[PDB]
Amino acid sequence: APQGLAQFIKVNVTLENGEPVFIYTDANGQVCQGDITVTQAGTITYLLNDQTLKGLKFVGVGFVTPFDGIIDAVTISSDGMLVQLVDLDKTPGTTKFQFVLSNTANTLLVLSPAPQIINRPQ
Amino acid sequence: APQGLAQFIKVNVTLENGEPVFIYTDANGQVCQGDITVTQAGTITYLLNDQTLKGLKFVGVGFVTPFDGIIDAVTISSDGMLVQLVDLDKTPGTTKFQFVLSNTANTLLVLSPAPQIINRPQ
Amino acid sequence: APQGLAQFIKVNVTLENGEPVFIYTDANGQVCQGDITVTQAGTITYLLNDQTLKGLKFVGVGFVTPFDGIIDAVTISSDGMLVQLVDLDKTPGTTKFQFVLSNTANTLLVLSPAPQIINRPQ
Amino acid sequence: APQGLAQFIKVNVTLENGEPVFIYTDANGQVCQGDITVTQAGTITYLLNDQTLKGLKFVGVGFVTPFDGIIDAVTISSDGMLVQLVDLDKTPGTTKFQFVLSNTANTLLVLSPAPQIINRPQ
Amino acid sequence: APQGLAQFIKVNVTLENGEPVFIYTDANGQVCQGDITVTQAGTITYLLNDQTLKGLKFVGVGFVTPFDGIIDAVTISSDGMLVQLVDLDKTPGTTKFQFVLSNTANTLLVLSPAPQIINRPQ
Amino acid sequence: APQGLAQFIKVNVTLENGEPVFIYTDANGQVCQGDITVTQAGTITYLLNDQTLKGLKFVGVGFVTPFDGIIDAVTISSDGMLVQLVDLDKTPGTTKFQFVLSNTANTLLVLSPAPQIINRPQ
């Protein structure tokens, strides 16, 4: 049976001037800008590396256009260290998303800036 | 003992072209742009009026600069229909925030565009 | 647009003879008896100061007559340190409530004794 | 190995004058007043029969003196229809408790009036 | 009114060769094999003694034949240290179950091997 | 940067003789036996197709040997319709797992029979 592609990205979070900075690294340790092109059905797995000392945990992935069909589903691990996106790459187009995280310093949710997902169907 | 100000805003959510649109209304039914100036300690209470048929519920309020001290705390009701912000208005400045909501159509979180809170301390 | 009043009360919890004692303090540090008169629409914000070493967290606010309309809604912060009441002060009358808290020593919920809210509509 | 006693009580909840009324029934269908004497180690199982149309669910059992040792633990089912108390009946004495329930009409927790548990150790 | 039997079993969990081993002990400290015969209506209370250093907590009790009527309900404590089974012992027969636990080392759930419950109605 | 393989399996659940039966189908609609061989790093995405009318939802994936390193992580969607496994395929070997699901008919968790994951590292 046919298998898609699994992409793996680390979401490193540091503090600069007291506020979070999101740095994505790829499977080669390279800092990457964060946008992703999806060229066939598959998954995107994000691992949190929280270096802020603010107790960050993922609570989900947010979208200003959540019904656009670019991302089919979001899954989250029980410890808030992993989120995975399912992208079946049938609907062509682009969508902006932001990571949503809790923190242990206060009761505000933390939002990343928004990368883009770009779907290029087969 | 001294009492602050309680502001009340309705967060109306409709769908246009299949995607959510956030319309804030004030205590007089007037559509307001959404930014808020806080001029003394108090609270901001947001009531959800979901007209999307997508089962929206608040899950919190997100911030790209969550440690800036403009908003002290966020509280949420058990039904996801209300969120309240505590703003003690000691730290002057401005912050951008986005509502974070779940929906019953898919597993993506929904983000509003970002209003600003502006603190003007006494 | 019209703004209500925001009241702020600290819920200090100590142990005496091994059991919790609830002491409310107002915005001037004064110990207050705990009952509140509401004279216009607004909010009541309760901040937990747990000095018991029993890991108390708010889980909500309970009522023996929960459908009486005196309190419209309860919101809670993710860390269990804040609860807020919405009181629109349309329904005149009085209601008794008790704080409900979890603790880390055992699996029993902790209840405060019951203050009263008294609504005096405009 | 030695076995304790398992008691079973139904917590029937009706509305009278728009507000909840708690009626306990025993294993013979008899209305009982609600206080329980425990004369050896065992469990007390409470089954909710909600006839209010307000969507009641147990969320726990609350105590004003939660560290008194009369009740050792509370367990709850995932549907909120059952709560069980563990009473090892080593500590003699009495304690007052109140059921704590959520409802689907509003975000206030519902509290029962308080029965007593009376421990008479072997 | 008629009272059933309350059975109490400790679920001791150790690590051998890096993996969990479940050892049940009865009310006399005796290691028992784990299967239980139920001869009248009652409850079975399982207390977790986690000696693995892996932060185990019960999250429930699982069944491959969950609709067979042998066990009527499962309740769980808020700290994950206790699970209780309600067995009304009307339906005669046997069922296999496995404890389900979370752990703090990873995001996989932990399953015990399966004991049997055997119902012998009165 | 290097990309792994994403496998997609549907977990169809029917009732036969009142009890759940798990039928896995692959990306071609073929019924498959359920065991999976993993030959490089990647993900396994399981979509629930519940045809039981018992309101099944995934709550996680359980393991009798959860620290064996074959599966690195489990993620779950908010609606309980998807679970995903991360398998980095560094640790060679095999592990047995069972799906864990809640249901709306009773408070017992539902367990599948156990497929195997077999890791063959590159």
PDB file of C-alpha atoms in Angstrom, chain A:
ATOM      1  CA  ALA A   1       0.000   0.000   0.000  1.00  0.00           C
ATOM      2  CA  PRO A   2       1.125   3.610  -0.775  1.00  0.00           C
ATOM      3  CA  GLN A   3       3.131   5.603   1.794  1.00  0.00           C
ATOM      4  CA  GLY A   4       3.419   9.431   2.142  1.00  0.00           C
ATOM      5  CA  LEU A   5       6.244  11.541   3.453  1.00  0.00           C
ATOM      6  CA  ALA A   6       6.972  12.271   7.120  1.00  0.00           C
ATOM      7  CA  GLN A   7       8.767  15.600   7.790  1.00  0.00           C
ATOM      8  CA  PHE A   8      10.375  16.352  11.220  1.00  0.00           C
ATOM      9  CA  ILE A   9      11.003  19.863  12.539  1.00  0.00           C
ATOM     10  CA  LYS A  10      12.196  20.979  15.958  1.00  0.00           C
ATOM     11  CA  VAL A  11      10.548  24.021  17.479  1.00  0.00           C
ATOM     12  CA  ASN A  12      13.208  25.640  19.585  1.00  0.00           C
ATOM     13  CA  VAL A  13      11.992  28.411  21.843  1.00  0.00           C
ATOM     14  CA  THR A  14      14.349  30.831  23.549  1.00  0.00           C
ATOM     15  CA  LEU A  15      13.829  34.141  25.342  1.00  0.00           C
ATOM     16  CA  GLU A  16      15.206  37.368  24.041  1.00  0.00           C
ATOM     17  CA  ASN A  17      14.412  40.542  25.946  1.00  0.00           C
ATOM     18  CA  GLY A  18      12.101  38.452  28.167  1.00  0.00           C
ATOM     19  CA  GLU A  19       9.924  37.246  25.272  1.00  0.00           C
ATOM     20  CA  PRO A  20       9.756  34.034  23.273  1.00  0.00           C
ATOM     21  CA  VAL A  21      11.579  33.555  20.001  1.00  0.00           C
ATOM     22  CA  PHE A  22      10.742  30.538  17.808  1.00  0.00           C
ATOM     23  CA  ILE A  23      13.621  28.978  15.828  1.00  0.00           C
ATOM     24  CA  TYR A  24      12.843  25.972  13.598  1.00  0.00           C
ATOM     25  CA  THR A  25      15.490  23.420  12.849  1.00  0.00           C
ATOM     26  CA  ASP A  26      15.327  20.696  10.266  1.00  0.00           C
ATOM     27  CA  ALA A  27      16.511  17.146  10.272  1.00  0.00           C
ATOM     28  CA  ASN A  28      20.126  18.348   9.464  1.00  0.00           C
ATOM     29  CA  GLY A  29      20.277  20.913  12.417  1.00  0.00           C
ATOM     30  CA  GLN A  30      19.870  23.683  10.062  1.00  0.00           C
ATOM     31  CA  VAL A  31      17.900  26.655  11.068  1.00  0.00           C
ATOM     32  CA  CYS A  32      15.048  26.908   8.643  1.00  0.00           C
ATOM     33  CA  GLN A  33      12.688  29.781   8.020  1.00  0.00           C
ATOM     34  CA  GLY A  34       9.631  27.733   8.942  1.00  0.00           C
ATOM     35  CA  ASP A  35       7.375  27.702   5.892  1.00  0.00           C
ATOM     36  CA  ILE A  36       6.718  24.244   4.478  1.00  0.00           C
ATOM     37  CA  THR A  37       5.880  23.067   0.981  1.00  0.00           C
ATOM     38  CA  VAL A  38       3.955  19.802   0.910  1.00  0.00           C
ATOM     39  CA  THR A  39       4.241  17.925  -2.388  1.00  0.00           C
ATOM     40  CA  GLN A  40       2.403  14.724  -1.451  1.00  0.00           C
ATOM     41  CA  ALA A  41       0.206  13.348   1.325  1.00  0.00           C
ATOM     42  CA  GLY A  42       1.974  13.002   4.614  1.00  0.00           C
ATOM     43  CA  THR A  43       2.680  14.295   8.074  1.00  0.00           C
ATOM     44  CA  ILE A  44       4.641  17.078   9.721  1.00  0.00           C
ATOM     45  CA  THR A  45       5.932  16.328  13.223  1.00  0.00           C
ATOM     46  CA  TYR A  46       6.955  19.235  15.476  1.00  0.00           C
ATOM     47  CA  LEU A  47       9.043  18.560  18.565  1.00  0.00           C
ATOM     48  CA  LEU A  48       9.237  21.275  21.222  1.00  0.00           C
ATOM     49  CA  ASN A  49      12.641  22.242  22.612  1.00  0.00           C
ATOM     50  CA  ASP A  50      11.727  24.793  25.264  1.00  0.00           C
ATOM     51  CA  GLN A  51      14.739  26.734  26.491  1.00  0.00           C
ATOM     52  CA  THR A  52      12.778  29.587  28.068  1.00  0.00           C
ATOM     53  CA  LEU A  53      12.391  28.185  31.609  1.00  0.00           C
ATOM     54  CA  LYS A  54       8.707  29.209  31.277  1.00  0.00           C
ATOM     55  CA  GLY A  55       7.326  25.695  31.157  1.00  0.00           C
ATOM     56  CA  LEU A  56       5.970  25.830  27.622  1.00  0.00           C
ATOM     57  CA  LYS A  57       3.741  23.032  26.357  1.00  0.00           C
ATOM     58  CA  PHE A  58       1.916  22.792  23.049  1.00  0.00           C
ATOM     59  CA  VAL A  59      -1.838  22.916  23.332  1.00  0.00           C
ATOM     60  CA  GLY A  60      -2.573  22.916  19.612  1.00  0.00           C
ATOM     61  CA  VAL A  61      -2.050  24.604  16.233  1.00  0.00           C
ATOM     62  CA  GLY A  62      -4.241  27.594  15.323  1.00  0.00           C
ATOM     63  CA  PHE A  63      -5.451  28.901  12.042  1.00  0.00           C
ATOM     64  CA  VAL A  64      -7.165  32.121  10.991  1.00  0.00           C
ATOM     65  CA  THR A  65      -8.738  30.176   8.073  1.00  0.00           C
ATOM     66  CA  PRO A  66      -9.301  26.776   9.731  1.00  0.00           C
ATOM     67  CA  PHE A  67     -11.795  25.448   7.165  1.00  0.00           C
ATOM     68  CA  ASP A  68      -9.623  25.940   4.096  1.00  0.00           C
ATOM     69  CA  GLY A  69      -8.671  22.239   3.850  1.00  0.00           C
ATOM     70  CA  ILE A  70      -4.880  22.715   3.628  1.00  0.00           C
ATOM     71  CA  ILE A  71      -4.268  20.910   6.941  1.00  0.00           C
ATOM     72  CA  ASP A  72      -6.649  18.026   7.604  1.00  0.00           C
ATOM     73  CA  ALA A  73      -5.959  17.393  11.338  1.00  0.00           C
ATOM     74  CA  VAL A  74      -3.780  18.217  14.280  1.00  0.00           C
ATOM     75  CA  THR A  75      -2.716  15.666  16.941  1.00  0.00           C
ATOM     76  CA  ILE A  76      -0.929  16.431  20.239  1.00  0.00           C
ATOM     77  CA  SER A  77       0.993  14.351  22.738  1.00  0.00           C
ATOM     78  CA  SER A  78      -0.046  14.112  26.382  1.00  0.00           C
ATOM     79  CA  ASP A  79       3.060  15.953  27.581  1.00  0.00           C
ATOM     80  CA  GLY A  80       2.616  18.820  25.141  1.00  0.00           C
ATOM     81  CA  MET A  81       6.027  18.147  23.587  1.00  0.00           C
ATOM     82  CA  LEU A  82       4.813  17.044  20.161  1.00  0.00           C
ATOM     83  CA  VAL A  83       2.218  18.212  17.683  1.00  0.00           C
ATOM     84  CA  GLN A  84       1.677  16.511  14.325  1.00  0.00           C
ATOM     85  CA  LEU A  85      -0.167  17.787  11.283  1.00  0.00           C
ATOM     86  CA  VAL A  86      -1.893  15.532   8.763  1.00  0.00           C
ATOM     87  CA  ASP A  87      -1.768  17.036   5.248  1.00  0.00           C
ATOM     88  CA  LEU A  88      -3.414  14.879   2.566  1.00  0.00           C
ATOM     89  CA  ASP A  89      -2.372  17.430  -0.066  1.00  0.00           C
ATOM     90  CA  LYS A  90      -5.547  17.148  -2.150  1.00  0.00           C
ATOM     91  CA  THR A  91      -6.586  20.850  -1.687  1.00  0.00           C
ATOM     92  CA  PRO A  92      -3.970  23.085  -3.343  1.00  0.00           C
ATOM     93  CA  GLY A  93      -3.231  26.444  -1.785  1.00  0.00           C
ATOM     94  CA  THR A  94      -1.636  27.979   1.252  1.00  0.00           C
ATOM     95  CA  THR A  95      -2.492  28.529   4.864  1.00  0.00           C
ATOM     96  CA  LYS A  96      -0.948  30.436   7.798  1.00  0.00           C
ATOM     97  CA  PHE A  97      -0.792  28.782  11.224  1.00  0.00           C
ATOM     98  CA  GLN A  98       0.504  29.608  14.668  1.00  0.00           C
ATOM     99  CA  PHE A  99       1.593  27.279  17.455  1.00  0.00           C
ATOM    100  CA  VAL A 100      -0.452  27.679  20.627  1.00  0.00           C
ATOM    101  CA  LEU A 101       1.279  26.926  23.944  1.00  0.00           C
ATOM    102  CA  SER A 102       0.571  27.133  27.622  1.00  0.00           C
ATOM    103  CA  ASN A 103       3.201  28.368  30.067  1.00  0.00           C
ATOM    104  CA  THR A 104       3.769  27.978  33.793  1.00  0.00           C
ATOM    105  CA  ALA A 105       4.581  31.614  34.519  1.00  0.00           C
ATOM    106  CA  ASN A 106       1.089  32.991  33.796  1.00  0.00           C
ATOM    107  CA  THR A 107      -2.308  32.037  32.443  1.00  0.00           C
ATOM    108  CA  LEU A 108      -1.920  33.651  29.017  1.00  0.00           C
ATOM    109  CA  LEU A 109      -1.515  31.399  26.012  1.00  0.00           C
ATOM    110  CA  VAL A 110       1.651  31.875  23.939  1.00  0.00           C
ATOM    111  CA  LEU A 111       1.375  32.231  20.161  1.00  0.00           C
ATOM    112  CA  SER A 112       4.202  31.871  17.666  1.00  0.00           C
ATOM    113  CA  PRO A 113       4.457  34.038  14.639  1.00  0.00           C
ATOM    114  CA  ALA A 114       2.824  32.452  11.617  1.00  0.00           C
ATOM    115  CA  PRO A 115       4.625  30.166   9.127  1.00  0.00           C
ATOM    116  CA  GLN A 116       2.853  29.100   5.943  1.00  0.00           C
ATOM    117  CA  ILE A 117       2.009  25.653   4.650  1.00  0.00           C
ATOM    118  CA  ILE A 118       1.928  25.442   0.867  1.00  0.00           C
ATOM    119  CA  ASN A 119       0.177  22.483  -0.756  1.00  0.00           C
ATOM    120  CA  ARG A 120       1.290  21.324  -4.239  1.00  0.00           C
ATOM    121  CA  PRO A 121      -0.871  18.252  -5.000  1.00  0.00           C
ATOM    122  CA  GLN A 122       0.304  15.285  -7.089  1.00  0.00           C
TER     123      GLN A 122
END
